[PDB]
Amino acid sequence: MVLMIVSGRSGSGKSVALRALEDMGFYCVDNLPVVLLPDLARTLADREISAAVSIDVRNSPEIFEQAMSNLPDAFSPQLLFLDDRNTLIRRYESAIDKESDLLEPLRSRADLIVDELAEMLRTRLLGKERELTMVFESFGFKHGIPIDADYVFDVRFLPNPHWDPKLRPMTGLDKPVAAFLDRHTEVHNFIYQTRSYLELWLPMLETNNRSYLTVAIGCTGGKHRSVYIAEQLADYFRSRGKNVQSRHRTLEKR
Amino acid sequence: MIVSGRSGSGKSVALRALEDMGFYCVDNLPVVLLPDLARTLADREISAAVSIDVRNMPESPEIFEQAMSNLPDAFSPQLLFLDADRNTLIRRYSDTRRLHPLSSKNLSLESAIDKESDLLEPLRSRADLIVDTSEMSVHELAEMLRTRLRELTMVFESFGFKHGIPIDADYVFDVRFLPNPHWDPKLRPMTGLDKPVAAFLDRHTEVHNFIYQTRSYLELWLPMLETNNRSYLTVAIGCTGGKHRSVYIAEQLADYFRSRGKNVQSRHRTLE
Amino acid sequence: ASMVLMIVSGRSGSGKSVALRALEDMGFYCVDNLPVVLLPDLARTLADREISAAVSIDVRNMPESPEIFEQAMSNLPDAFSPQLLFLDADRNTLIRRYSLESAIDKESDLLEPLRSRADLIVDTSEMSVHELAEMLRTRLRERELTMVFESFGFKHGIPIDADYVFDVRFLPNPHWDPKLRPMTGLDKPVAAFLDRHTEVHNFIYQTRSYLELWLPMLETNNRSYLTVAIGCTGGKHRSVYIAEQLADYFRSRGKNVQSRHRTLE
Amino acid sequence: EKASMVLMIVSGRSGSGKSVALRALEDMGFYCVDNLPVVLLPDLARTLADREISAAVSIDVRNMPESPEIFEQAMSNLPDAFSPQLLFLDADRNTLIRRYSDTRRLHPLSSKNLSLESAIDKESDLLEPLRSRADLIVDTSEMSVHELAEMLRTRLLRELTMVFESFGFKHGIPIDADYVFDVRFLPNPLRPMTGLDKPVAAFLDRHTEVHNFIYQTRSYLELWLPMLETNNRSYLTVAIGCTGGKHRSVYIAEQLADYFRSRGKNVQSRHRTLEK
């Protein structure tokens, strides 16, 4: 029932961290006043789940220590701090100067600073391996089914990007193809329903000593629909704390 | 300001704008602890915004009302509600996350959205205003809320075009094509308020159809005009002299919208 | 009786579909690509309805020998007076309208008979869909009621000559998107923005529907002008597009209308 | 033996993109006639029969006879060689409104409609006869015009055969498979027996998780079966795989067939391992 406290300069990705903790099951409350930190736990402790809160420029150490010190035994507090200028500007030094001054009480006593960045948080809260690896690979039926695939799903019935002719040389990773497929509802239903189906058996497939679970998504060419769906399916289970890798057999000279 | 709505309805952009406006915005605060929050800000003397979604909904309306009963006299007790048609929300949802990371497993994406609305009916049913973001863009909801950040008074005024159209008028209706009461020089000195002129125009069906169609046309936009920060909606009925036809119609239009529980005022510019 | 049969012909890309569409607005029953042999049969079906008809004759539809045209033409009921229209545009222009050049010559060659027997010929090299629209209307007058649709900004005041004024300041705003703030309602981006919102279509539809209810009664007493003022705040975005769309609508209704944007002048 | 051609009937509400279909159908070579009166539909066909070319005609609010009986008369008394096929395009009510240019009347030869949404509804009401008897429906609500062009051009307008095959992974994945499901986590069965044998059947039937698996998998396929039935593909091959291809995989495929066979689908089962 940890109380992961998320801190860091404005633009360092604390909003992304809170989202990650949200995926794990933590109750995330943004910009809550520090004084009411006990109240949240007491209200949430009964639910028997962990919680995470954000403390930034929006959110005097006496009240700070007092409020943190004023806390139920059930929940054990942990404090996190995130922290480059050229990168921070991209996420967004008159603002930084006050920000730098204000990042000292907690920063000096911070557990981690933590300065690829998306998944990195998974490594933080343990995780790794001795666990099942989920492989999501795209392929084209004209080239054949990957030899190692365990599940194969045909997506050639979905809307085709070979209909906006400015997309034929693009791949499923390119944002235009993403936006094209994203506007269609059946694409969202397929991703949702396919992973929902896999989650029904994912606890049962984890048994024994399975080393790999390879799910192959197939369209005709293996460059447009299959690539995008496989990546979107992979990204879903990453939010679920799984160890996954995606591989696009056609987009690697084959 | 309480921001609520189905997943994908644009609550995240509202808070960002509202926070930009200067509000203290807190996401996912438990409803019971909403009063406690207010007391902390009272000294600072600033408004606040909070989000209530499927995560925060008590699924028991008493607790919401209970929190309301203990709510301090402060500036911010207003409720905002955003929504969208189901299929648009589905398009907005990036498929790389659970929709209810803290609830059961939803059977279908349209089942999750319906159940979301079903359990979120209490707050909507007693919601101040709804916003159908179905056609609003990413950037459009920002300026709409920024720009949008008492009730509307309907003014029905008759006038004569020969003196000019009222400066404050929002809608102007020309009624100089209607049957003329000057075809009865008994009525030439009488006004539209006098019962003889009323019965004369009432006997003609086209006048009642005009009033019916005119009030019907106004009612089409009246809910959308009521949501603006309009202090007045001025509807001007104009004939040539401003004494016969125009006067009578304004009387009937006012009387109708007054019957609908609307805030109305009547003014006959020429007869004053 | 006395119903018409306007036959529209011309090379592919000369705009017969736009002419055919215009005749449809007037009330014509328009049939595209009907085989010439069935021209009498079509008329007989419409005779009971007592309406005029218009048909297209192209290279796809053109028969192999002119005799069958006259045979079908002669075998059409007396009630119907046939009239033939022929459109032709510049050689290069048709290609732009379609989206070979030797084939286009053959198209002209195969359509020599109808051009020789055309009642009226109209070049469409310089015309735009509006220009040909009123061109057909003119062939089918003057000294009538003139409908003026003018946009204005309420901050500047109401046009003095306005008969109806409609406030549109409750509709979606284009000044929201910071791309469109320097654009006007005439600019295609603002059109697409407002076109995307359904309520804009309903306001235009319902406003013109309301005016048609009283338009016959407003026509009398030798009224020379009916001025409808559409007003937003600045008079450059919403009011311009709505007023322009309203004017364009009644043009299809066979009315004489003018649009004028007080702020954009 | 005999030769036969087609008459594609294009219908749908104003703004649903039937005009694009006719342009596409015209590109393929169809003789396309817009707004032809229904009564003359046979008469038109007779003229084209000799030329031996296909034909396309549009039936919208202008053409529908209000009395639906008249349509059937033309269809029943229609000359042979021409096989009627019906296409119907539709879109969302609010979506059609956005597509509607306001510079022309929507029903230019019918009594004026009360509201923009009443006309679209009445339009739908009057086209229920054609919609109910449509061969294929296309919802254009989410597609632009140019993709609707290429979608129809790419598409042709056959009844679909669903293949359920069991296999063993040690021998390889079937080349012809379209969907593949791994069932190697299910309760394991009997070593010389095959999945067709009732003991292996009763063994797997005894486990409830098998019933949950079949139910969830075929329910999953039904989500896409309407979209796959209208995709010109002649075969949909669903491969169920266990390790040996004789025990678990065999039993699941047969029950999937029996379900879709009970559902009136064209199915065949083939067990790759039990043939060597």
Side-chain angles (χ1 to χ4, degrees), chain A residues 18 115:
Chain A
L18 212 39
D115 74 291

Side-chain angles (χ1 to χ4, degrees), chain D residues 19-50 52-58:
Chain D
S19 43
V20 190
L22 292 185
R23 254 121 61 181
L25 290 151
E26 180 153 290
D27 294 331
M28 291 300 105
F30 285 68
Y31 192 71
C32 303
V33 176
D34 189 18
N35 208 353
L36 177 77
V38 172
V39 201
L40 307 187
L41 211 44
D43 291 330
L44 166 62
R46 311 192 173 281
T47 60
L48 307 186
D50 305 326
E52 208 170 64
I53 47 88
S54 292
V57 64
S58 68

Side-chain angles (χ1 to χ4, degrees), chain A residues 33-41 43 45-46 48-54 56-57 60-61 63-65 67-72 74 76-81 87 94-95 100:
Chain A
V34 279
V35 201
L36 250 53
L37 285 164
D39 288 330
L40 166 62
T43 58
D46 58 331
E48 195 178 330
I49 49 162
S50 172
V53 312
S54 68
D56 207 344
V57 190
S60 38
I63 171 63
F64 164 52
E65 262 67 33
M68 196 138 66
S69 318
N70 288 310
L71 199 148
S76 55
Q78 196 171 341
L79 51 94
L80 175 53
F81 185 107
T87 296
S94 69
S100 66

Side-chain angles (χ1 to χ4, degrees), chain D residues 65 67-79:
Chain D
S67 49
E69 46 186 326
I70 272 75
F71 172 59
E72 194 60 15
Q73 325 295 112
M75 293 265 99
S76 318
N77 93 317
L78 195 72

Side-chain angles (χ1 to χ4, degrees), chain C residues 1 16 70 88 121 152 195 212-213 229 235 243-244 256:
Chain C
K16 24 183 171 303
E70 293 76 85
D88 196 328
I121 278 194
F152 71 96
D195 224 27
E212 280 176 331
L213 293 171
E244 196 56 37
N256 192 246

Side-chain angles (χ1 to χ4, degrees), chain B residues 1-15 17-20 22-30 32 35-38 40 42 46-58 60-104 106-139 141-148 151-182 184-187 189-202 204-272:
Chain B
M1 182 59 66
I2 304 179
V3 184
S4 180
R6 305 157 112 188
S7 312
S9 56
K11 304 179 283 292
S12 43
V13 57
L15 293 185
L18 270 183
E19 182 151 292
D20 292 331
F23 293 67
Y24 195 46
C25 302
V26 176
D27 189 18
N28 208 353
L29 191 93
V32 278
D36 292 24
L37 166 62
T40 60
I46 47 88
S47 291
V50 71
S51 68
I52 289 196
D53 55 19
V54 81
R55 318 169 283 185
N56 289 249
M57 272 305 295
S60 50
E62 291 86 29
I63 286 75
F64 171 54
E65 295 287 76
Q66 166 58 55
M68 305 300 106
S69 318
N70 204 146
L71 231 55
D73 278 5
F75 38 93
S76 291
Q78 200 41 258
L79 173 57
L80 172 53
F81 187 106
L82 290 79
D83 204 332
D85 69 308
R86 340 292 190 280
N87 301 92
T88 296
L89 301 161
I90 293 179
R91 303 156 188 167
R92 289 163 157 165
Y93 159 51
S94 83
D95 311 279
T96 89
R97 79 174 79 175
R98 269 205 94 211
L99 217 47
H100 305 148
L102 312 178
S103 164
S104 56
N106 320 281
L107 183 62
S108 295
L109 241 183
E110 188 147 33
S111 275
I113 298 287
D114 160 57
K115 195 189 67 180
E116 194 162 334
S117 67
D118 203 355
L119 76 87
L120 241 183
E121 173 183 16
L123 197 150
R124 184 186 198 274
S125 175
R126 291 181 276 115
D128 152 39
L129 91 162
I130 318 171
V131 185
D132 186 350
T133 64
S134 160
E135 311 173 344
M136 258 163 285
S137 64
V138 185
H139 318 75
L141 187 43
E143 322 276 5
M144 188 276 189
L145 280 202
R146 165 229 170 196
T147 280
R148 205 121 301 170
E151 301 194 359
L152 172 129
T153 292
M154 299 180 77
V155 182
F156 295 86
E157 59 184 342
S158 65
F159 73 98
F161 277 97
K162 67 188 199 195
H163 307 147
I165 315 170
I167 36 174
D168 58 341
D170 297 316
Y171 289 86
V172 181
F173 293 99
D174 186 354
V175 301
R176 292 173 290 182
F177 68 97
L178 295 169
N180 211 332
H182 290 197
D184 195 341
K186 138 172 55 180
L187 307 171
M190 306 188 69
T191 71
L193 311 163
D194 309 66
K195 316 204 184 310
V197 180
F200 168 62
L201 285 165
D202 190 5
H204 299 172
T205 166
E206 53 277 50
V207 165
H208 176 69
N209 196 43
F210 183 82
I211 294 160
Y212 174 86
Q213 295 291 345
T214 295
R215 64 169 189 86
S216 299
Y217 178 84
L218 292 175
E219 280 176 331
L220 295 172
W221 334 118
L222 195 55
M224 286 168 268
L225 292 158
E226 285 167 346
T227 61
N228 298 17
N229 227 31
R230 254 191 184 71
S231 309
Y232 285 89
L233 175 64
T234 306
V235 172
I237 305 302
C239 65
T240 310
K243 181 182 177 178
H244 295 102
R245 287 163 292 185
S246 56
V247 170
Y248 174 75
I249 297 195
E251 277 292 323
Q252 289 300 291
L253 283 172
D255 285 347
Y256 165 77
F257 284 103
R258 200 282 305 170
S259 69
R260 289 317 277 174
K262 298 307 193 180
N263 184 244
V264 306
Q265 185 170 44
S266 62
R267 173 183 183 176
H268 301 295
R269 280 224 154 180
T270 55
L271 303 204
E272 66 188 16

